Amino acid sequence: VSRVGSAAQIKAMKKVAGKLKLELAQFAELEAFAQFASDLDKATQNQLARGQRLRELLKQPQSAPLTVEEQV
Amino acid sequence: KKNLGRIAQIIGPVLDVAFPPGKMPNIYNALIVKGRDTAGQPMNVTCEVQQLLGNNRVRAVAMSATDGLTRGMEVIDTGAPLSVPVGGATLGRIFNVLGEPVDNLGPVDTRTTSPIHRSAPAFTQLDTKLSIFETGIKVVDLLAPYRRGGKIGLFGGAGVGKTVLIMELINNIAKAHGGVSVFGGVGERTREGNDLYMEMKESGVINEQNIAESKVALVYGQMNEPPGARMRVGLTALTMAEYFRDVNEQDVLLFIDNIFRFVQAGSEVSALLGRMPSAVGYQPTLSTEMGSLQERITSTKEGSITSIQAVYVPADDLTDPAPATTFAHLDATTVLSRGLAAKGIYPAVDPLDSTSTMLQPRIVGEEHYEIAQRVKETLQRYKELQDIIAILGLDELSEEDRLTVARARKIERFLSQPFFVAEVFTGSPGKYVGLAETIRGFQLILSGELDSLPEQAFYLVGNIDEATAKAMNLEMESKL
Amino acid sequence: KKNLGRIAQIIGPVLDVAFPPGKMPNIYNALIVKGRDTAGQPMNVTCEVQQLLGNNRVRAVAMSATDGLTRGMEVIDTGAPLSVPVGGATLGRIFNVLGEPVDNLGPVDTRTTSPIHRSAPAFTQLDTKLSIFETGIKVVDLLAPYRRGGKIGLFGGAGVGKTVLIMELINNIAKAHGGVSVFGGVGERTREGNDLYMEMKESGVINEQNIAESKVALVYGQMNEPPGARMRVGLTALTMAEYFRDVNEQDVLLFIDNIFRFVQAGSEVSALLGRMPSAVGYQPTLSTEMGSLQERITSTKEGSITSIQAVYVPADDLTDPAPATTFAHLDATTVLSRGLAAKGIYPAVDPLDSTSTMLQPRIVGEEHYEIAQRVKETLQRYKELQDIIAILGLDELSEEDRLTVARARKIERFLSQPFFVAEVFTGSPGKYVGLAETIRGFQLILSGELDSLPEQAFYLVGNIDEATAKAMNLEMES
Amino acid sequence: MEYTIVVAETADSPATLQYLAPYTGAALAEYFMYRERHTLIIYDDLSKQAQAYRQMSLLLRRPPGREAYPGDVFYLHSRLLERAAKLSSLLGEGSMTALPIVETQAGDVSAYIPTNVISITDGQIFLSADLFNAGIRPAINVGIS
Amino acid sequence: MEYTIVVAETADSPATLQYLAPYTGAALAEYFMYRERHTLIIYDDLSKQAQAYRQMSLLLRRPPGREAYPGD
Amino acid sequence: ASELAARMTAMSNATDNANELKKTLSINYNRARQAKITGEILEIVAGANAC
Numbered sequence A: 001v002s003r004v005g006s007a008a009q010i011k012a013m014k015k016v017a018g019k020l021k022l023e024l025a026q027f028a029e030l031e032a033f034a035q036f037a038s039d040l041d042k043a044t045q046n047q048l049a050r051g052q053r054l055r056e057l058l059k060q061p062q063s064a065p066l067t068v069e070e071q072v
Numbered sequence B: 001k002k003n004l005g006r007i008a009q010i011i012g013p014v015l016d017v018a019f020p021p022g023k024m025p026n027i028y029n030a031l032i033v034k035g036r037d038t039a040g041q042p043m044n045v046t047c048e049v050q051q052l053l054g055n056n057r058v059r060a061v062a063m064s065a066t067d068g069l070t071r072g073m074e075v076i077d078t079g080a081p082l083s084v085p086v087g088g089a090t091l092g093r094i095f096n097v098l099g100e101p102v103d104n105l106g107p108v109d110t111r112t113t114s115p116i117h118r119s120a121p122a123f124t125q126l127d128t129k130l131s132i133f134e135t136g137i138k139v140v141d142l143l144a145p146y147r148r149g150g151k152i153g154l155f156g157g158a159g160v161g162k163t164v165l166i167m168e169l170i171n172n173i174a175k176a177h178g179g180v181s182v183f184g185g186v187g188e189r190t191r192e193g194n195d196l197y198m199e200m201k202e203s204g205v206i207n208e209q210n211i212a213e214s215k216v217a218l219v220y221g222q223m224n225e226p227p228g229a230r231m232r233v234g235l236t237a238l239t240m241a242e243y244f245r246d247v248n249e250q251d252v253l254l255f256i257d258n259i260f261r262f263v264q265a266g267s268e269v270s271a272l273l274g275r276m277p278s279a280v281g282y283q284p285t286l287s288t289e290m291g292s293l294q295e296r297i298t299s300t301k302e303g304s305i306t307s308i309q310a311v312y313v314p315a316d317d318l319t320d321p322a323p324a325t326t327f328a329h330l331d332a333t334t335v336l337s338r339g340l341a342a343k344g345i346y347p348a349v350d351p352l353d354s355t356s357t358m359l360q361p362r363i364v365g366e367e368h369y370e371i372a373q374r375v376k377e378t379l380q381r382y383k384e385l386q387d388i389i390a391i392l393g394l395d396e397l398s399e400e401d402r403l404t405v406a407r408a409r410k411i412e413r414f415l416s417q418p419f420f421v422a423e424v425f426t427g428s429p430g431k432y433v434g435l436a437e438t439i440r441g442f443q444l445i446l447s448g449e450l451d452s453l454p455e456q457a458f459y460l461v462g463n464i465d466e467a468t469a470k471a472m473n474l475e476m477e478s479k480l
Numbered sequence C: 001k002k003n004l005g006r007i008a009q010i011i012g013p014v015l016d017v018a019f020p021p022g023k024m025p026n027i028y029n030a031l032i033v034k035g036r037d038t039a040g041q042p043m044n045v046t047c048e049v050q051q052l053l054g055n056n057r058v059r060a061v062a063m064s065a066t067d068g069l070t071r072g073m074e075v076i077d078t079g080a081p082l083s084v085p086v087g088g089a090t091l092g093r094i095f096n097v098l099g100e101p102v103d104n105l106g107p108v109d110t111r112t113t114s115p116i117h118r119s120a121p122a123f124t125q126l127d128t129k130l131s132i133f134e135t136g137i138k139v140v141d142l143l144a145p146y147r148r149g150g151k152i153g154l155f156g157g158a159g160v161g162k163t164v165l166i167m168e169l170i171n172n173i174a175k176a177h178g179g180v181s182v183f184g185g186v187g188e189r190t191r192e193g194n195d196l197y198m199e200m201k202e203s204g205v206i207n208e209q210n211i212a213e214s215k216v217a218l219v220y221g222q223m224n225e226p227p228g229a230r231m232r233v234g235l236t237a238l239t240m241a242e243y244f245r246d247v248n249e250q251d252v253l254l255f256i257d258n259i260f261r262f263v264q265a266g267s268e269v270s271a272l273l274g275r276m277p278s279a280v281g282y283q284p285t286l287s288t289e290m291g292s293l294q295e296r297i298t299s300t301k302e303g304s305i306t307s308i309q310a311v312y313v314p315a316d317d318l319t320d321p322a323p324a325t326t327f328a329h330l331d332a333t334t335v336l337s338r339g340l341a342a343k344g345i346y347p348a349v350d351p352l353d354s355t356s357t358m359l360q361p362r363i364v365g366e367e368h369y370e371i372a373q374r375v376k377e378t379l380q381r382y383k384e385l386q387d388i389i390a391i392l393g394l395d396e397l398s399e400e401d402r403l404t405v406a407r408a409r410k411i412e413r414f415l416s417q418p419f420f421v422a423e424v425f426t427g428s429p430g431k432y433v434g435l436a437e438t439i440r441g442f443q444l445i446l447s448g449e450l451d452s453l454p455e456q457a458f459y460l461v462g463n464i465d466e467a468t469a470k471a472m473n474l475e476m477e478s
Numbered sequence D: 001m002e003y004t005i006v007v008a009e010t011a012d013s014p015a016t017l018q019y020l021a022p023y024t025g026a027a028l029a030e031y032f033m034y035r036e037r038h039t040l041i042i043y044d045d046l047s048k049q050a051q052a053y054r055q056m057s058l059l060l061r062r063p064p065g066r067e068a069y070p071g072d073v074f075y076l077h078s079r080l081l082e083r084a085a086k087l088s089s090l091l092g093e094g095s096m097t098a099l100p101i102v103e104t105q106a107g108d109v110s111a112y113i114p115t116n117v118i119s120i121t122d123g124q125i126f127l128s129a130d131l132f133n134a135g136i137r138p139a140i141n142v143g144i145s
Numbered sequence E: 001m002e003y004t005i006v007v008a009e010t011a012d013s014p015a016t017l018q019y020l021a022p023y024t025g026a027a028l029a030e031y032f033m034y035r036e037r038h039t040l041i042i043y044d045d046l047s048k049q050a051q052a053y054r055q056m057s058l059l060l061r062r063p064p065g066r067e068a069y070p071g072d
Numbered sequence F: 001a002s003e004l005a006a007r008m009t010a011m012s013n014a015t016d017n018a019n020e021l022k023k024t025l026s027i028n029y030n031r032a033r034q035a036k037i038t039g040e041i042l043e044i045v046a047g048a049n050a051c
């Protein structure tokens, strides 16, 4: 949780990552629910694809920081 | 100020003050200690009598920081409890525990004061009217409608959304509220106290050009305060909110954030007052303290106080005696879930545990009531099934149970709502939702006329017209 | 002309000793009670000042049995803390807590003595060199590599293998060690100290003749000892270790089994001192008593102590404060499991709960670090699947999750290893496994080139070649 | 009963005599150990000595720990069981095999009193209740012992 | 280290100095906060500040609370 | 009939694994239940003496 939110960001990050917190939180609900169905439709199967690409954005090696340019 | 005392002990926030043998302060009087600061100048530090101890000495809890005080300093007794300035001169102003103005403007006119300790109104004076007010929130207006003149709790652990919900009620209600609002900040963040002050100004409720044409009084007792101050912040704020009720005869909003910190600050000083601990490390006077404060907050025949107060639930444990004492005093408990906030469903109101005494067909009608039951029956049915769909899957369900699962997926998303105050968290603009728009929307999810839309169409929408128009964008971008 | 005390009180091993008003002993100074028995007069009741009480009275803790002490015996203040012989005279010798030889040999040369209460080395005098340290063990060399010159913990409850694993780290390392090893026995079986004293002599380490060329000093305060003695055993062994670091400037190994019993004894006498206990009945001074031992262990720019400690974990509860206060001091923690020891996998090391500072690619290498990750990613995924396969079984898992279950079921058995020390339990000979053998043995399971072999081929074999040769006999014998 | 001493306390007996009696029976067994004989001591419920010493020290108003047992609970049973030893030939080679008996509650080996004695004892013989109810007497769980 | 202060209290130190190490660091940070600079402060282990304060208050014989931590 | 008896075999093994699970969850609950009460009173009896 960040209790300041997108006020602690620049305008560029707020335009891009302004909804990324609640999209991954809602994806992680439906990825755990997608293991419970055998044959699932494409509008779920698209969002399971986009959600697993948004998780791969967020991984970093130690002490190799990304500049805010590289982050946007 | 004829009684002079001397400090006998300083252990933490608690003092022991010794007095002449015949003349002693009564309990809850305000002892003003003639302390001195780091320069040697005279500095007044106010304390409050808790108990007479015998051998002509009292035990007092300080309302300021006790570091710098000395055994042997003069303590005067004012002969009265903490008098706090009340009235129209306290509108748009920020106060201490002691009624002193914090907000770096002029002195407050103290011609009308009221002591912070008084009794609750009698049983004769209580009013009987059961009215509902509209909040703009879909879970609240459907499943826990708020009582006008009533006492409302917001329960939840740290980070589920009690503060963003109470800032949204201030946005929706206090602008169109007829009378005075009073915010009592009890034991919270000074950033969030400062954050609220700016919010009042941009909404025009502090009214910084013409002060006391405003409609709010702010009292702050934040986390950096000693526990003596935190016990009485609730009392000071309520002494202000009871003047506008009793004397000015008008309906009052009393927002308290946080009423747990009233209970916690008593727990920090109870063992130093000499009391054996009760269960869970709490003072043995937990329910009498909660009771003393809560009973005062009531609507009478002269005026009305609608208290909307957050209650912190430590470790998400609702069986803790500080939330468990609070539930009996309220007219609508809005329990906030961390399971729903970890999903990103905001406001994270657990609809199966959030309830109201106003959800009766004699009060809201039978159209609201029959759909508020069918929503709670659908979400209870889905709560029972999450175990066996985890083990055995969705394919083992009947087509009746796959249907009530699929609607409870869509109800739970549609209970979520973008807030005006949560635009820096949702990333999308907020929505005020009426009750008729709420009733119309849940009648469509339950009937089955919206079974074709995806489940993400109902996420963070205001209206049911916004859920379908979001579903048209999700069908177009599926092609793109 | 030392000041003379009288005993005022005897409460267990805690004595209150009345002194004249002009002269009081300082805190941590040793007191010698005159003592008396049926036959003779033993001055062997040494005390140690803990608290100054007032009314010209101290509170001391005894290092021996207080049976036979009378209120009103003469007490001699030594004027210094508890001193212990240190140097080459301590090599090959078993000591008391008091620095006194137990091994029925000649008296020690007490020309060089040293107090057991010393401040830690300064912040300036530390060294920051992060060398890896090889033990010959597959769980240890791969997934939690040990710090050459740093604190190391072995966590686990009763009967899981902390003592057998610590006897493997003596066996693989202390003979190959170029310096002196020091063993500290704190609250253990006196039988286990008898076996170690024979294992040292049979391995040629403590030679019977020419005992001053032995390179092991043993210090024992065991289970039978009073709780004031068992507080100060670890400080007696540590004082002797930090002589060789500071003055002889050698690399020292410091095995301490058990440092939980150091805490538990400091909890028992803290009840007798009248202190208000902390959580779970423990002493309030727990993090300071524990940190006073562990901050004297760290390596300096002269020498280097490597300490391997066994930390007993009560009731299999790593959230207990005495295991929990130990974790902050350690460079590598090797948590042993009971659920793995109930299966018979030995050493019963939990491969995911065992951690290390060292497992970083600038220290271990990039080939070692990318495979220690892939073992732990495999065993984490199989850890998450054991609620699905607990009820439904393996039959409902997908094609990928069954392949991760199949490889992680083979990783867990190749993590186990026969020990030299455990050849009297099982009869099978132990195997030293080098790290070059360990990295290539887990390269083969994760690349999948040994997926055709049975899972029991990987159980209790040294190399991956022995897993191949065992896989033949399970496939050959019909 | 031509080579056996029975040291008997009952449940009706006070807590100090139940705390005392294993030290009595061990000192009877040390009279023969140091006189070159071999000896076998059995303690039936070391579990019930631990609860009698717990009774004593909670009445003494001593601060307890896990399961309200005091801190001296490990040192209670390790004064007792470290007296069991095969002596050297310089003393005459007496021995004392100690077989303490510890009762568990539903097989809780992680309980405080079974886990203290397992850390003192050289081995353990798990008698399991699934085997005793199935008529597999003696109910010795071989794989865990 | 060109822009960093390190305040260090190791576990060999008494509990009063571990209790005061964050207040030693924060008074340094408030020196720069009030001279128009921006400051970052990391307290590596607040949980260990509370355990040092639990030790001090239990040897002062103050009445304890949950997990024997004092009320304050 | 082979499908419906493979399922009957699977639901037999699942309901007996869930029986073995429910037993050790009832034992591990009672350990945590009793340790909670013992730890709760020892905080209260410590506070009752400390005043």
Ligand SMILES: Nc1ncnc2c1ncn2[C@@H]1O[C@H](COP(=O)(O)OP(=O)(O)O)[C@@H](O)[C@H]1O
Pocket (backbone or CB within 6 Å): A001, A002, A003, A004, B156, B157, B158, B159, B160, B161, B162, B163, B164, B165, B346, B347, B419, B422, B425, B426
């Ligand atoms: N209505 C909401 N919409 C979006 N996010 C929210 C909402 N309510 C709470 N949150 C998230 O929860 C965080 C903390 O909630 P807060 O109101 O501070 O609760 P508490 O007072 O219990 O800590 C907020 O910073 C925000 O990230």
Ligand SMILES: Nc1ncnc2c1ncn2[C@@H]1O[C@H](COP(=O)(O)OP(=O)(O)O)[C@@H](O)[C@H]1O
Pocket (backbone or CB within 6 Å): C156, C157, C158, C159, C160, C161, C162, C163, C164, C165, C346, C347, C417, C418, C419, C422, C425, C426, D119
């Ligand atoms: N590598 C091993 N192989 C076989 N058995 C082992 C091994 N390690 C430990 N054990 C068994 O565990 C028992 C107890 O181990 P021990 O080292 O006494 O545990 P702890 O140090 O926790 O008391 C040993 O007696 C032995 O039977």
Ligand SMILES: [Mg+2]
Pocket (backbone or CB within 6 Å): B162, B163, B188, B257, B258, B310
């Ligand atoms: Mg809050």
Ligand SMILES: [Mg+2]
Pocket (backbone or CB within 6 Å): C159, C161, C162, C163, C164
């Ligand atoms: Mg052991």
